[PDB]
């Protein structure tokens, strides 16, 4: 049958570093009717520009206004077809807690073949470091390893440009990769960085 739209559920929003804020939802049951989705937004009483979801992506909208940090905005989805108009439950959040940074670049092993047990790493943090304080997740393994070893996430817990990996076997080649996110844990993890290599000397 032909039915009015179901109340949108599971409304989440993500700010990918470099892109504008994007929000996703679950449209619900099939209405068998042309349904329009609109993402309403506002801060304090003042309203943001409305976002009308494209027909190719009917459960996603990327706002037209620049990302705003350190204030509390109110977002909700409004679904409508020929048979009715329903609004989702409103969500209130600070977009600073919904950031997905870019993975750190320039990952390199500085002192290859210098010390027997340690290898120092260096990278370049993403530009979003000006807003949030990053926490990292460094992984490493040998060339022939099937699984990755983990650097204790409690040490890589503040914004930093380098890290000194200790307790490595002599003259063995290692590979590393790092990801980052807001130190709160309130946000999204970045993807893995480009892998960096190095040898430990004898």
């Amino acid at each position: 049958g032909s039915l009015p739209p179901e109340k949108p559920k599971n409304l989440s929003c993500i700010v990918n570093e470099g892109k504008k804020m994007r929000c996703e939802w679950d449209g619900g049951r099939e209405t068998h009717l042309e349904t329009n989705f609109t993402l309403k937004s506002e801060w304090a009483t003042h309203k943001f520009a409305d976002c009308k979801a494209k027909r190719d992506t009917p459960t996603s909208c990327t706002v037209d206004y620049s990302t705003v940090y350190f204030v509390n905005i109110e977002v909700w989805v409004e679904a409508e077809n020929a048979l009715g108009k329903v609004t989702s439950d409103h969500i209130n959040f600070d977009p600073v807690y919904k950031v997905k940074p870019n993975p750190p670049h320039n990952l390199s092993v500085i002192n290859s073949e210098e010390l027997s047990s340690i290898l120092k790493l260096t990278w370049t943090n993403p530009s979003i470091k000006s807003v949030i304080i990053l926490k990292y997740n460094i992984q490493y393994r040998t060339k022939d390893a099937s699984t990755w070893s983990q650097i204790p996430p409690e040490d890589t817990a503040s914004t930093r440009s380098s890290f000194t990996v200790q307790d490595l076997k002599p003259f063995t080649e290692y590979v590393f990769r790092i990801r980052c996110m807001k130190e709160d844990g309130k946000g999204y993890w970045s993807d893995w960085s480009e892998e960096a290599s190095g040898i430990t000397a004898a």
């Binding site: 620049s66 990302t67 705003v68 940090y69 204030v71 979003i128 000006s130 807003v131």
Partner: peptide, 9 residues
């Protein structure tokens, strides 16, 4: 990023 945030608000 923070200058555009303030100007947007």
């Amino acid at each position: 990023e923070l200058l555009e945030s303030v100007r947007m608000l």
